[PDB]
Design a protein around this ligand. Structure first.
Ligand SMILES: N[C@@H](CC(=O)O)Cn1nnc(-c2ccc(Oc3ncc(Cl)cc3F)cc2)n1
Ligand SMILES: [Yb+3]
Ligand SMILES: [Yb+3]
Ligand SMILES: [Yb+3]
Ligand SMILES: [Zn+2]
Length: 607
């Protein structure tokens, strides 16, 4: 059962198609229009159905050209309000009907961020973007807001003519709006069935540059050139991902570089991956995020988790595929380095929640839990650790990659549970069932904390990071003069980041050590968002007051939650910056992404 949805489940009825016709009004901060749902009954004598909605204004519901009775139930917190539709005629099993719902979004839709021109690069035009994952599609349109249901979609979007609309679909033309010549209509088609959290929309002053045979990069004009360079390896990654997962079925693989308030590193929207502008390091060093989003074209978008309790199926397999792409491009020692880094991020998450916390379990129970509050590195890294452990136990990467491809083939276009995955693993590895029966499944899948077994990792690229970090941690005041810019000469940006991660795990360090690190390494000058984030966290946790304006600036000038949430939390925990952290959040709250605003609010205990 999907405990995050209030809609009729897949066993009652299934949405087969959505035909969306809407208009974006920037003055009212509203999306208005019709969502035409092609619903197939899965039951005999079906006379009503329930849809998920959240802060939607419903005008009418039309079936067979006539208005039908509908009712909106009491709001159930983050789940929204259930919408019961009275069908005009009882439906037999497998019978299909079209339900056209006239709706309007609230300006406070948790799925959307409305940007004023001042909040964009260009400063002349407003901007809109959606983020439906996990359960925010119900805050845009009435739907069965569950990944257990997959549907195709077509969309027609009216926007002011000076702007461009894009969706998680194939672009299907543009025309002047026949109802308003100050507007344009942008058309879209998604022929591959998808869960509704993969529905996405962006409206802004967008420009494009071709960077591959099936890839355009999209952003405001100011970011196009930098984005084209940063993501130039995209086609190479797609070719490797196809070799590992089978055919790319989505047609196009475009990239959209969002404004800095985009709350995640990326979003695997089909045909149009969304990315944070914090990836624009200038040297392609944060491109693993692209490898991760590309990998989702197989794991997550083709093979989907049936409910959000099984989310690890989505991320664990994606991180696994992502690390193989980087492994093919830069070698097996690099894949091991990234895997070990991943284990360290898992240690961090387990330490933050506490080793007995229910969110440290691989398979979770989201009954009465807002998925946004549960979000962490655990399904990513505990999920990856399991697969990497299975890879070693079952004979190596080549053998395990054979399983990955067969798993994708077996479950493409379906929504599955952990039991479905485990059953297939046992079927594929029938000749190694004795090895599989040695796995402590109850601990790996259902127990909190660190996994019962840690995999084996090649140390070649990690050794220099640990050695430098340990030199700083063990150093006394009279050893600080020995550090010099030459200590970093043989370290890649990835190794610099790992050195900071290792040191941050032992934070605080004495204030004199942090001051010396800046003196000799000039970390303040580094623009790479990952390195800068860890360096600022290290400064704040080591109580360096000079870092307060830098940390406040980074936390607010961008909104990627991975950075913004721990920076605000570190600033709130430092006595010297506590008041500034709270006040800065209060003054920025209204201009923030709604999900980021909620979570920073909870982290700071500011209601
Ligand atoms: N897809 C990513 C980027 C990427 O990985 O490529 C972007 N992204 N956007 N939203 C989310 C997201 C995912 C799960 C959420 O909820 C849950 N979190 C943990 C568990 Cl165990 C179960 C849940 F349901 C809430 C939000 N992820
Ligand atoms: Yb066409
Ligand atoms: Yb079985
Ligand atoms: Yb000494
Ligand atoms: Zn992912």
């Amino acid at each position: 059962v999907d405990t995050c949805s209030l809609a009729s489940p897949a066993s009652v009825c299934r949405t087969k198609h959505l035909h969306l016709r809407c208009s974006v009004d920037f003055t009212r901060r509203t999306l208005t229009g019709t969502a035409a749902l092609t619903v197939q009954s899965q039951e005999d004598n079906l006379r009503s159905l329930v849809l998920d909605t959240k802060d939607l204004t419903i005008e009418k519901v039309v079936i067979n050209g006539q208005e039908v009775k509908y009712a909106l139930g009491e709001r159930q917190s983050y789940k929204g309000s259930p919408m019961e539709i009275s069908l005009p005629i009882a439906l037999s099993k497998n019978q299909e009907i079209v339900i056209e719902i006239s709706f309007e979004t609230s300006p406070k839709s948790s799925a959307l961020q409305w940007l004023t021109p001042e909040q964009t690069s260009g400063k002349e035009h407003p901007y809109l973007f959606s983020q439906c994952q996990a359960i925010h599609c119900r805050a845009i349109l009435p739907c069965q807001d569950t990944p257990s249901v997959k549907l195709t979609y077509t969309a027609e979007v009216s926007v002011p003519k000076e702007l461009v609309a894009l969706m998680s679909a194939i672009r299907d033309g543009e025309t002047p709006d026949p109802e308003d010549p100050s507007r344009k209509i942008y058309k879209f088609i998604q022929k591959v069935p998808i869960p509704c959290y993969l529905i996405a929309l962006v409206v802004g002053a967008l420009e494009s540059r071709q960077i591959g045979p099936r890839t355009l990069v999209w952003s405001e004009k100011e970011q196009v050139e930098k984005s084209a360079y940063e993501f130039s390896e995209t086609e190479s990654m797609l070719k490797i991902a196809e070799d590992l997962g089978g055919p790319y079925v989505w047609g196009q693989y475009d990239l959209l570089v969002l404004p800095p308030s985009f709350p995640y590193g990326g979003m695997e929207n089909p045909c149009l991956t969304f990315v944070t502008p914090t990836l624009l390091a200038g040297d392609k060093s944060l491109s693993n995020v692209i490898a991760h989003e590309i990998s989702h074209s197989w794991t997550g978008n083709l093979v989907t988790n049936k409910t959000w309790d099984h989310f690890w199926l989505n991320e664990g397999h994606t991180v696994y595929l992502e690390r193989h792409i980087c492994g093919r491009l830069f070698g097996e020692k690099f894949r091991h380095f990234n895997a070990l880094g991943g284990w360290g991020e898992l240690q961090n998450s387990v330490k933050t929640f506490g080793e007995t916390h229910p969110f440290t379990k691989l398979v979770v129970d989201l009954t009465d839990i807002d998925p946004d509050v549960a979000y962490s590195s655990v399904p990513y890294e505990k999920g990856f650790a399991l697969l990497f452990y299975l890879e070693q136990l079952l004979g190596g990467p080549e053998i395990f990659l054979g399983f990955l491809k067969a798993y994708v083939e077996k479950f493409s276009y379906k929504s599955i549970t952990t039991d479905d995955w485990k059953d297939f693993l046992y079927s594929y590895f029938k000749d190694k069932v004795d090895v599989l029966n040695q796995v402590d499944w109850n601990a790996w899948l259902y127990s909190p904390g660190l996994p019962p077994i840690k995999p084996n990792y090649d140390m070649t690229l990690t050794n220099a990071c640990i050695a430098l970090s340990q030199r700083w941690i063990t150093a006394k005041e009279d050893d600080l003069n020995s550090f010099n810019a030459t200590d970093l000469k043989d370290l890649s940006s990835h190794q610099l980041n790992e050195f900071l991660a290792q040191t941050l795990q032992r934070a605080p360090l004495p204030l004199g050590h942090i001051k010396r690190m800046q003196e000799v390494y000039n970390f303040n000058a580094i623009n790479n968002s990952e390195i800068r984030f860890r360096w600022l966290r290290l400064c704040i946790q080591s109580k360096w007051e000079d870092a307060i304006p830098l940390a406040l600036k980074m936390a607010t000038e961008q909104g990627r939650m991975k950075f913004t949430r721990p920076l605000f939390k570190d600033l709130a925990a430092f006595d010297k910056s506590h008041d500034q952290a709270v006040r800065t959040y209060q003054e920025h709250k209204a201009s923030m992404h709604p999900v980021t605003a909620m979570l920073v609010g909870k982290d700071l205990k500011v209601d």
